[PDB]
Amino acid sequence: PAYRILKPWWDVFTDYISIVMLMIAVFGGTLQVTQDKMICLPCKWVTKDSCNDSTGPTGIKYDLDRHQYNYVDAVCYENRLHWFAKYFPYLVLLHTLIFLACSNFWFKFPRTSSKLEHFVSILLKCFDSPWTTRALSETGVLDKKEGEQAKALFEKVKKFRTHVEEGDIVYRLYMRQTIIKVIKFALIICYTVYYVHNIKFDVDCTVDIESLTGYRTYRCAHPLATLFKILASFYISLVIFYGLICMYTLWWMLRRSLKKYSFESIREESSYSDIPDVKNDFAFMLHLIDQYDPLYSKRFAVFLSEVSENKLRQLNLNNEWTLDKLRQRLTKNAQDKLELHLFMLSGIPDTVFDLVELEVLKLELIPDVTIPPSIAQLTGLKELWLYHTAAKIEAPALAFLRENLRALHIKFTDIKEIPLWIYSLKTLEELHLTGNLSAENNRYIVIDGLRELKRLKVLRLKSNLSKLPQVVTDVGVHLQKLSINNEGTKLIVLNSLKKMVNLTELELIRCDLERIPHSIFSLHNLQEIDLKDNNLKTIEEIISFQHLHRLTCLKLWYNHIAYIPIQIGNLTNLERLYLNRNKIEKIPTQLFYCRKLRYLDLSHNNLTFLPADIGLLQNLQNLAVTANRIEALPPELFQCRKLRALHLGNNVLQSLPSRVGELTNLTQIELRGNRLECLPVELGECPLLKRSGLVVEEDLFSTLPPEVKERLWRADKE
Amino acid sequence: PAYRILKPWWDVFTDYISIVMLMIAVFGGTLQVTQDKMICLPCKWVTKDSCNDSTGPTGIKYDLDRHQYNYVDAVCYENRLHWFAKYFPYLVLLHTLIFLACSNFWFKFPRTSSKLEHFVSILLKCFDSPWTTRALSETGVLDKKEGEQAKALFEKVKKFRTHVEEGDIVYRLYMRQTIIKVIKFALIICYTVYYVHNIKFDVDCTVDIESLTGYRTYRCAHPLATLFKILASFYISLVIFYGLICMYTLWWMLRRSLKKYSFESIREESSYSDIPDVKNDFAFMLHLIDQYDPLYSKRFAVFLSEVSENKLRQLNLNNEWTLDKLRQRLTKNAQDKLELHLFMLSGIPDTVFDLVELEVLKLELIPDVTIPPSIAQLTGLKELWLYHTAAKIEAPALAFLRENLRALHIKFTDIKEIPLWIYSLKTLEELHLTGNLSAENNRYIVIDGLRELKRLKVLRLKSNLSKLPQVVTDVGVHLQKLSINNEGTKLIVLNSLKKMVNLTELELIRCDLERIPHSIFSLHNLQEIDLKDNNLKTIEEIISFQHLHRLTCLKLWYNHIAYIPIQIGNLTNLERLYLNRNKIEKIPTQLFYCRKLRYLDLSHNNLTFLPADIGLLQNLQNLAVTANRIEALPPELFQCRKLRALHLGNNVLQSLPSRVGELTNLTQIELRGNRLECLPVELGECPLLKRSGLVVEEDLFSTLPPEVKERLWRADKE
Structure with a gap:
């Protein structure tokens, strides 16, 4: 009932043959035990130890008692009968017992x-499971218990x-049994055929x-000799069949x-082409x-x-990740949008496509995943973030994303x-x-596809571009922002940055320019420009920067x-x-003539003084001079x-003058690290400072x- | 334990006949083993090697010992008794065992x-399934796990x-067994009938x-001969019955x-004519x-x-989407009409036709669905939506749709x-x-059949067409509204718009025209014209637009x-x-002669100040100058x-004039992004401001x- 799957036709045939041999053995044994008598009549004229067969016919007088006949029969049966005739049932019993032992050797050997x-249990579990049925049917919906x-x-x-696979004991054991x-x-056939004529x-x-x-x-006459000969011939035929099997x-x-x-054949007909070939002992x-x-x-x-395995893992992660877990995983980013972050996942759970309130989706290391058509459900999806993830897409998904x-x-x-x-x-x-x-x-x-992005307005290229692509220059005629981060790689434009007339903003970070190119002056639509991490030394090109009318x-x-x-x-x-964070030594008053200035940082500079015209910028609300050599605060x-x-x-600022409290718009002050003695009393009168x-x-x-x-603590707490 | 289902009645009869034959074989065998002696008396006068058959009568003295009688009996049993008489029970036992082996060959042959x-397990599993009961009762909602x-x-x-169906091993094996x-x-009856005469x-x-x-x-006399003969006749009769069966x-x-x-019979009493003929091995x-x-x-x-399968799969789907949940999923579109969407469903539920008050029906990603005649019930249906859903149709459904x-x-x-x-x-x-x-x-x-619509009024095209089709021109003789979306690809017309004399509204979305075609001006009855994202810079062709008097x-x-x-x-x-979203920097003074203006949009442009002529546009109600360079609000x-x-x-709005309260009709205003330090007291006197x-x-x-x-809080609350 358990190992019957491991018994082929030859094994069951041999088992039935052994059963028949056992029946023959027990029948012969009980027949010999019940009666196996001899009937002996003496030779009156004996020549070569055998009588030569030398008014009406009459019987022969032997003058022997019945008990003498019984004694003669017993002696002849014990002595002059061939051992085969006496021991045939026991010999066939021994042979069939050894055959059964050989057959059951591997079943009764624990190793x-x-x-x-274990193989029987594994095969039964794989056969009766419902997952294999649908795996064959596919050539998805699954239950958690099933998963x-x-x-x-x-x-x-x-x-x-x-x-x-590394055992290799079953095969050799079966070979030894065979x-x-x-x-x-072979030996039984030889000896039994040679000795069956001796009965x-x-x-x-x-x-x-x-x-x-x-x-x-x-x-002597052996009445059962014919029946024993027939049984021996039948056993010989059964042994011949067993040996042929x-x-x-x-x-x-x-x-x-x-x-x-x-x-x-199985792997090619089931579309599972990547099925490894089985090694020895399996x-x-x-x-x-x-x-x-x-x-x-x-x-x-x-x-x-x-x-x-991958399909089952995908179904398991679909089932396990409930909607409530994803809702608890929802995040609000700096742009105030519902963010759902997926990291270190083999595939995208299908439950994430149930919360239509998702706005920005981030995918990081999601190998061999394909975008499901269910992405169309997420109407509110706006941002897709891919981190080192080459993912495939479907036609409905492609249309929805387009x-x-x-x-x-x-x-x-x-x-x-x-x-x-x-x-x-x-x-x-x-x-x-x-x-x-x-x-x-x-x-x-392969980047010529940038022409297709008709609505592209915000672009960020980080590829260490020692050469500026001409496709980007041609597509910039409708772009509005371009932040190139080369990680310190030198930027070469070969006079191709003046073609993006509609480029409203331009950012050059870690481009290692070392000097301002003249192509920036042609960007009349520019409003915010930065050369951070370019190690710029001179910015006298502000003279030619005057072309930018709306440079705010x-x-x-x-x-x-x-x-x-x-x-x-x-x-x-x-x-x-x-x-800020520059090597500026002194600040000329010329800069202070842009009275609409509102943002200005001078932190981490070698400045040791503050000019007079600093206070003429009445629109300024951000003054960052952190970690400077300023030691006197000008009134x-x-x-x-x-x-x-x-x-x-x-800073090295010695003290804060009393005029600090005269400002009613003050909200925040950064003062840690200064050579200050005591804060002025006037600083505590600011209505908005807490x-x-x-x-x-x-x-x-x-x-x-x-x-x-x-007062400060009460204002801050309440 | 009900494996007997595969056994027909004749198999049962043969098994019982074999049981009876085995019983009589055992009886004869144990009878022969226990008592099969022959009694032999020598013939004093012998003729032709046979008995001659020839103061009161007296017994005949043979002068033979009892052991000599036993020897004569044994030698006669060995030699002069027919082998059939001696080995009838053993031959019967062997033939019965052969018959049983043949009967149980296919039952025990593993292949x-x-x-x-597998066949009997599948049959028994199918029999207990309530699906069969439901199908029979079809000539009604159960558990999902049942489906x-x-x-x-x-x-x-x-x-x-x-x-x-590919094996064909059971039929040939059964035929060979038979x-x-x-x-x-045949062989047993021939030899047994021929050799039964010697008992x-x-x-x-x-x-x-x-x-x-x-x-x-x-x-000699065989005292057991008559019983053996009647047993042989009984076995011959049983063998005759077995052979007849x-x-x-x-x-x-x-x-x-x-x-x-x-x-x-199935395609007649149940009309299930889709069942194919079953080939061998099944x-x-x-x-x-x-x-x-x-x-x-x-x-x-x-x-x-x-x-x-299809009909009860549809029944299971209807059980999945009950009417209450279906109406829960029922919503209203942007046109304030009842709409129902079906996404990622294997088929269209029949229960969707319960609600005849629907007007918009969305079918997205519903594979291989055929439109049923049941759509005729939804007389109130007005819009059917297909999103990547290949749909087949029948005559009544198409008739209702038409x-x-x-x-x-x-x-x-x-x-x-x-x-x-x-x-x-x-x-x-x-x-x-x-x-x-x-x-x-x-x-x-493919769209050559668009001419068949003689009542087509509004045509909306999303096909990314390089050139305007001639079929569109043919069908435009009766159209009213045209919406073209080239997805940013430049569209070539070559004077192909003047044929739409009865066209009322022309909409061109993402056509990348870069220049207004002159055929637009020739449509004197045009009402609304759009050039949404067509890379246009100059619109000086309005001199030709002056031919269009009704361009509201x-x-x-x-x-x-x-x-x-x-x-x-x-x-x-x-x-x-x-x-809006244009390079417009200033409003011309002549533009204000258009006193009919009511909706003006100038947001996200280079506007810096508002002309003093804006006050003459009293019909204006909606104005949008968001994200501009407006320093102050003009009086x-x-x-x-x-x-x-x-x-x-x-904007860069600095001060808000107190005259905002004069706008008693002002309802919607925003102040985000504008550096407004203070507000007037008239702002709260406007009844429509909340x-x-x-x-x-x-x-x-x-x-x-x-x-x-x-006051503002009270207005907002109620």
Whole structure:
């Protein structure tokens, strides 16, 4: 009932033959025990120890008692009867017992019985499971219990295959059994056929007992000799059949090299082309199964396809990730949109396509995943972020992304990681490419699809472009933003940056320009310009920067600018400025002639003084001079009545003048790290300054009057 | 334990006959073993080696010992008794064992045992399924798992049919078993009938043993001969019955060609004519079941019919989407009409036709659906939407569609999936085509049937067409509204718009025209014209637009329009003008002669100040200058009394004049992004202004007077 699957036709035939042999043995034994008498009549004329057959006919007088006849019969039966006639039932019993022992050797040997039982259990589990049925049907909806059962079955199959493939004990044990059976059959046939002629009805007895009966030789009849001969002939025929069956088994084991299973037909007909071929000690068991039924091997093959594992994992992650877990995983990014982050997942769960409130989706390391058509359900989806993930798409999904998606973020490290269908997404407007794409004589060739992005407005190219692609220059005629981050790689434009007339913004970070090209001056639509991390040394080209009519901002932080050019104040259009973390030695008053200035940082500079005209910028609300050599705070600086926040910390400023409290728009002050003695009393009269905005050292905050402390704490808490 | 179903009645009769034959074999064998002695008396006078048969009578003295009598009996039993008389029970036992082995060959042969057990297991699983009961009762809502297991049963039945139909091992094996039984019966009856005549009570024995007893011939008696003879006659009769049953089985198996099955009663009493004929290796087992009883075959044939599978799969789907949940999913579209969408469904539920009040029906990604006649019930249906859903149709459904529809939405990714019967419709007013269709050597051939619509009024095209089709020009003689979306690809017209004399509204979306074609001006009856995102810079052709007197609304936004020509003031008929997202920097003074303007859009442009002539446009209500360079709000703007919308966000607005309260009709305004330090007191006197209509910073909202804040809160609350 359990191992019957492992018994082919030859095994069951041999079992039935052994049963018949046991019946023959017991019948012969009980027949011999019940009666096996001899009937002996003495020879009156004895020659060569056998009588020569030398009014009406009359009987022969022997003058022998019945007891003497019984004694003669017993003596002749014990002595002159061939051992084959006396021991045939016991010999056939022994032979069939040894045959049964050989047959059950592997079943009763633990070192192989455990493997056989485990294989039977694994095959039954793979056959009766419902997952294999749908796996064959597919050539998706699944239950959690079914998913966990299938996962357990897959791991059990893998561990069992790993354990069994290196054994190679069942095959050689079966070979030994077959060889033993064949040689035993041969020897039994030879000896039994040669000795079956030694049992006969007429047997001549010469036991040499004349002191008790007086006769030398006796002619004895064996009444059951014919029946025993018939039984022996029938047993010989059964042994011939058994040996022919064993020889068929031996031929079957030495014809196709059962150490190897090709497994090609099952994998090719089931579309599971990547099914590895079975090695030794596991191909033999599958050969036995095929002899029994190929259907079990067919149902078991789907657990070794290297694809059904991926499908089962995808279904399991679909089932396990509930909607509530994803809702708890929802995040609001800096742009105030519902973000759902997926990281370290083999595939995209299908449950994420149930929350239509998703706005920005980030995918990171999602290998070999295909975009499901269910993406059309997420109407509110706006941003798709791919991190080192080469994913496939479907026609309905492609159409939905072409007609709904607006922003795409791409982080990659190889050409194959860039989906080819991103070009057809014509509603895409915000693009973020992160990853090297420069190639030797192949650069910017597969990137000709940028023309298709008609609605592209926001572009970010991070590929260490030592050469600027001409396709980007041609497509910039409708772009509005372009931030190129080369990670310090030098930027070469070969006079191709003046063609993007509609480029409203231009950012050059880590481009290592070392000097401002003249093509920036042709960007009359420019409003915010930055050369951060370009190690710029001179910015005197602000003279030619005057062409930019609507240039409302200018950032030059994190550079080697040694001084502020006198021409920078002539661009009255400038409103926001970033000049901190530079090597500026002194600040000329020329810059302070752009009275609409509102953003200006001078932190982490070698400045040791503050000019007089700093207070003439009444629109300024951000003063960041953190970690400077400024040691005296000028009273004229306090004229900026609209200075919401100022940063003075880490400086060498000795004290804060009393004019700080004259500002009612103050909200935040950064003062930690200064050579300050005590905060002024006037600082506590600011209606909008609180402890959140008043960040200073512990002792400096302790220098304030207690009423100022309690007012600040009450304002901050309530 | 009900494996007997595969055994017909004749198999049971043969098994019982074999049991009786085995019983009589055992009886005869134990009788012969226990007592089979022969009693022999020598003939004093012998003629022809036979008994001569020739103061009162006295017994004849033979002078023979009892042991000599026993020897004579044994030698006569060995030699002169016929082998059939001695070995009748053993031959009967051997033949009975051979018959049982033949009967149980296929039952125990693993190669066909697997097929038999799989067939009986599938039959028993099918029999207990409530699916069969429901199908029979069809001549009604159950558990979902019942439908799941029904589909699993259907799939496994199909797989088993595909597997077993290729083998053909059970029919040939059964035929060979029957042939072996018949030939064995013939041989056994021949030899037994021929040799039964030798079972005689008296047997003439001439063993020729003179040196032992001294008599030539003997006259033996077989006391068991009569019982053996009657047992032999009984066994002959049983063998005759067995052979007759075997001949009947052979005739039944060699007359109807069991390699094929009819399956004709199902398509008559149930009209399930989709069941194919069953070929070998499956028809044989079905015939055996029919021999048992045809009920199992009848209740199992339904699983081979795909029509029953489809109908009860649809029934399961209807059970999945109940009416209450269907109406829960029922919503209202953007046109305030009842709409229902079906996404990622295997088929269209029948329950969707319960609600006849639907007007818009969305069918997206519903594979291989045929439009049923049940759509005729939904007389109120007006719009049917197809999103990548290839749909087949029937005559009544198409008849209902041709006279009870308003608009049709067709979204496709491939040419072959669009329905072709759409052209037969005549009640259709709006047709929505979505998907690129242009190809070479078959250009614009799929939509050649668009001319069949003689009532087509509004045409909406999403096909990315390089050139305007001639069929569009042919069908435009009666159109009213045209919406073209080239997805940013440049469109070539070549004077192909003047043929649409009755066209009312012309819409060109993402056509990348870069220049307005002159055929637009020739449509004197045009009402609304759009050039949405067509890379237009100059619109000076308005001199030609002056031919269009009834151009109430002109849409020229999402383009690169640099400056508005002064000739736009000639078109005083403009009422709704969109000019946002353009390079427009200033409003011409002549534009204000168009006093009919009511909707003006200028957001996200280079506007810096508003002309003083804006106050003369009293008809204006909606104004949008969001994200511009507006330094301050002009005073003359406040005299436009019925301005219901003023979008001034993301500007550089500094001071808000107190005259905002003069706009009693002002409802919607925003102050985000504008550096407004303070607010006037008249802002809270406008009845139509509410807190939800006031988009302002929370602290700047607190800057409102507390009475004004309470008034705005009261307005917002109710």
